[PDB]
Amino acid sequence: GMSEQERIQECLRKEIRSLLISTKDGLSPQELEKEYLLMVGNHLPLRILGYRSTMELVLDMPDVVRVCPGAGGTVILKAI
Numbered sequence: 001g002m003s004e005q006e007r008i009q010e011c012l013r014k015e016i017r018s019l020l021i022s023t024k025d026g027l028s029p030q031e032l033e034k035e036y037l038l039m040v041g042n043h044l045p046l047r048i049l050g051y052r053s054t055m056e057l058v059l060d061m062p063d064v065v066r067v068c069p070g071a072g073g074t075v076i077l078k079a080i
Helices: 002-021 029-040 054-059
Strands: 065-068 076-079
Touching: 002 029, 002 065, 002 076, 029 054, 054 065
Parallel strands: none
Antiparallel strands: 065 076
């Protein structure tokens, strides 16, 4: 039960890190949800994990994703 949820959390964390590692200089939160659907073949599991957005998801994994700035306060997400 709780063990199954931990393995969902581990699987997504590994998927996000793998996506951000494969890029040159990170992705915007919007580019990451697009890329996740394209490369994983499923949408980010936001609703089922209690997230309203990609930002909410990535802020819940600060050991996996680094929140970096850009032009006009835009966010670029990078793997750690």
